[model samples]
Target: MWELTILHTNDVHSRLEQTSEDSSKCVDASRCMGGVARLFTKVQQIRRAEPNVLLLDAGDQYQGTIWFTVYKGAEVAHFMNALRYDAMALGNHEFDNGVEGLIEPLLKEAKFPILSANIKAKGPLASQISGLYLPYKVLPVGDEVVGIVGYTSKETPFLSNPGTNLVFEDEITALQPEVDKLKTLNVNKIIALGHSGFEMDKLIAQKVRGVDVVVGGHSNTFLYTGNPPSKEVPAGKYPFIVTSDDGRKVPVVQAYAFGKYLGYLKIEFDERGNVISSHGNPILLDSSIPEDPSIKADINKWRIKLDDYSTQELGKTIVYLDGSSQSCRFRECNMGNLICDAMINNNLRHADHVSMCILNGGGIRSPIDERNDGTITWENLAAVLPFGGTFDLVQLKGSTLKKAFEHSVHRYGQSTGEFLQVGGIHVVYDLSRKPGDRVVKLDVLCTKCRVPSYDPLKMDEVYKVILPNFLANGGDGFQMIKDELLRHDSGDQDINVVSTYISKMKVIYPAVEGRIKFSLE
Candidate 1:
């Protein structure tokens, strides 16, 4: 029998600092939990104790918090180098900057290889990413040669911006052949490292043969042996056992996001590489864990340049912003309202008669909790909208607007990330209604109409809509943002618009405003 320990994290999203005591942003550094420094400490401790160990990350080490916003991908790349990960699966947010996005900073800084099997290496998209992507790697761990294959989400094209050339092949379809090749090489110990969700992770584990284990990301799944406190309850048991099609037992694991948890999976494989027994759990990184001093110091060193971003106060919020995925994705969220309202307000101020604007719920990352000061800072605002999206004012007909709304609600009751958040418009939808027609009623605040009041959408009439260029250019399945209707670019990044909107307000309290009304009411 041979044993190897896999230490992994997924969807870390540049959380350089520990979460505050209240679990808001990284306000209280003293009593916070789960930063890369803390995670490094734990990983190093385990490696020191157990010589046969592999440190891995299942994607998404970029884009969230001011750390990533200020330093961009550099912050993540720097820490990743220091941590000395064995291998990393490409995350969707890694492409948030796009393949041509980073160009070479992280590409050069990373000491480890970034792997993705499903992406084509010889296409127009191949030119977009000039090398540094790997399909798989065979490493000597302990006495055995372990072959690891990597895969990213195929749905990334619809959910994010991965460039035009990178075609996404289905994960299972891509992995089976790769696994067979590894088997031919006499590598009995095989692992599939990827950035897919939990449900998809299990499917890969069950269907893909010759894979001893599948460590996954993208869903920020927290698998545990026991109870996990705080806001995140464990979604499943650690090392979720799945019976493969050939009756092989495969275990899957993933850590929660934002440097909050570290997944530890240990396996004692039999002589033929069939898993005989396994044990592990995601270690909740709290204030109790000691942070590596070197990593802590480097974080502080880079953080020096972002002092202005940290201290620059935008405004005070009388109410907390509910940007939680639980709230924002399912229905209209106050934070969503705050953001969309900013766009619509900005456009209407410069132009005239803009009826509404819509923002994606997935864009809202963190919540604005009612802290002692209730202050919103440049860092806070930047953290909320880290994509650097500028606003665009487009002229789409009411019929087109209605279609957009239908697209937004198409995934209603399913907790999808594409749910729409709007301003200057109100909607009443029935989840029970079929897709493409769930929007029961819609009303726009008619500012320049015959009577300046709420009016039912005139399907034939065109209305000016303020939205982020990401959506305007067909990101997140908003294909209805037709090109001919696009009037002009506001040229205002959403982060700036939000900051300006807050600065202009005395005390902002952006409520839901019944902008999205549900059925059964």
Candidate 2:
């Protein structure tokens, strides 16, 4: 029997510093849960103890904090290269700024292969990538030739801006062939490494033959075999075992995001390359782990510049602004209310003309904790909304708005980014109903009425709405409103608008109203 220990991370999301248990900015590093230095140190310790080890990242090494907003992927490249990762799949946020954004860090500078089998790049992207976007990479680990095949979410175009040049395929369709090809070359012990969500990962294990293990990302699922070390609740057992089509047991694992945990899976394979035993848990990078000094020194250099922007006090909050993915994506969240209200409030000139504000929940990246007198800093705001997309005031027919609302609830239970967080409207969606027709009741505050009132949204009526420019241009598959008339382009970045609102208000408390409701039936 041969054993290999896989140490991996996913959805690091530019959390270069140690964070609080909630994954917010750390008030005290001595008590924080995770940092890049801590992750590096743990990986180093494991490599020394295990005879055969593979260090990998499932993807989403970019976005979420001010670090990525400032340096893009350059810093991620520098640190990940230093960590010496074997391979990394590309997450949806990796394409947030489009293909050219990747050229600097991933294509030219990364020491390891950036894998994505489902993507087909053409035009300028093809020339730029050359051979960097590999389908799979074969490595000789110990005595076995291990094949790692990769795939990203096919919903990428709807989730982020991958640009027109790259075409995405379904994860299973793209990965199965790669696995077959590896088998043809006599390579066994195949690991399906991808950024597809846990559900897709299990499907890949069940559908794709010959995959021994699956490492995944994109959903930020927390999986563990025992009580969680930190606050994050486990989604399922660690190495969530999946029975393959050929009846082989395949283990799937994903550590939660923000560098909070590192996935550790040790597999023992028989001589025939079949997994005989597999076990491990995502190691929580809590206060106990010491930061690697060399990596900490390098991170200290980056922090100097980051602190200048992150430390600036913006305003104050009376309540914890909940922007965590679980809350915002599934239902109406106060952070969403704060952001949407801020946008509408900033556009005072259109106050009478525009009453509805709808923003995608995905844009609300992190939460603002109430620790330290509920002090809101530039860092907290940036972490909460980092994409820097601006507002666009559009006049769309009620039908289009209904369509948008319908799209929002279509992905119902899972943490799909398309979920809507709205203002000046109350929409009730019936989960029992099918996706395309989920909107059971809709009421929108009247725009241009002398006395404002909640009125039933008439499909033919044109109402002014303020939304992200990304949606106005069809960023998140809101194609109905893409061609709508622009009442105004505020050009004010989302962070700036919210910052200004918070500054003006001084002390703010936002609560989740019944702006968006769900009926279970």
Candidate 3:
């Protein structure tokens, strides 16, 4: 039996700095998490014990912080090259800059193979880019030949449009032929580096017979840590070997996102080359570990560049902007109100009688601190709207507007981003009501200063609804906006909106002022 160690991370959304002001040092001894520097330290410690180790990432390598925003993921590629990632699965955020943005950077600069069996690249990106996808790579561990195939989630279509002709297929359908091909090659071990979430991983393991192990991504759920067991599966699933369709046990593991945890999986294959047993664990990358000096140097080099861009103040804050779970996750809190208000204030000049600005909770990335320092930097703003979604103005009637809010209610408690935060309109809904019909009272505050508040449903006239481009164009299942839009473009920078609005108010703190109210009864 040959012993092989796999060290994996997923959804490292460009958190390049360590927890400290000095990028080279770990933040503190107790809670150390940041950058590839710490990851390098952990990888080295594991390699000392097991020489035949594979370092892999499950994707979402782009679009979280100012590092990606500054260089369009080039800096991340530089760091990954330094870390010497052997293979990586494409996460949805990989396409955030779009195909054109990625072609010159990742495709050309990256030394490692980016694996995604389902994502087909054709068009300008395909013709110019080299090594878009390698079906599988053969790795020799002592006498054992291991075959690894890479796959991305099918949610790419809903997530992004990297290229004009890029297409993503169903994972099961795409992997069948690949598995058969691998089997025919007589590879001793078969592994899949899958970007599909945990639920999809379960389905793949149950259906696909040849796969011996799967390293998953996208859900950001920790695999081996002792969290609550899922209601769907018993025996406390995760970081454990499960029986596959062929009655062989296969191990599945996933690390949580943002480099907080590193997933470790160990597998032993019998003489017959079938997976006999497996174990998995998530190593918490906290401050107790020492950061690799080499990777730390690289991080510091980038941190200087980031600092230069982040120090200049963009605007001041009049109110405290908070986007924590206590305030914005389950219900409308102060932070949601402030974000919607920022959207409204930013576009008030450009909009033609815009009724309200509705921002999805998911779009607000981080909380604005209430320090009253009046220092708003570009980096700070980028952290707020990290995804780079466009802004749009849609036209909807009062009745349709009510229906949009009704749709938003179902998303409540499930996904905060689906919860609509509307400005210029006071909305009250009954949470007890069924979805698709939950609005109890809807009032619209028209843009016209002369006109007071009017019942939104009674107008019978089309009202322009201002919203972020993602929600305006069916993102988060806001499909009602599709038929109600007149103009759509990359909207203004939301940070700029928030900053300018704060300057105008000149207030020290802003709080959620009852923009949206709901009664459970």
lDDT of 1 at 373: 84
Per-residue lDDT of model 3, residues 326-377, tens digit only: 3565566676776676676666777435657777777776565544364556
lDDT of 2 at 317: 90
Worst 10 residues of 2 by lDDT: 483-492
Runs with alpha carbons beyond 4 Å of true place in candidate 3: 19-32, 123-126, 227-237, 240-249, 315-320, 324-329, 350-352, 370-375, 411-416, 428-433, 438-443, 446-461, 486-490, 503-508
Candidate 3 versus truth, CA RMSD in Å, comes to 4.2
Cα lDDT of model 1 overall? 0.82
lDDT of 3 at 375: 56
Residue-wise C-alpha lDDT for candidate 2, range 143-179, written one tens digit per residue: 6788999899998887778899899998888888889
Q: How many backbone clashes can be found in candidate 1?
A: 1
By TM-score, is 1 or 2 better? Answer: 2
* Consecutive 10-residue window with the lowest summed lDDT within model 1: 482-491
Q: Give the top-scoring candidate (TM-score).
A: 2
Q: In order, how many clashes per candidate?
A: 1, 0, 11
Q: Candidates 1 and 2: which is better by lDDT? A: 2
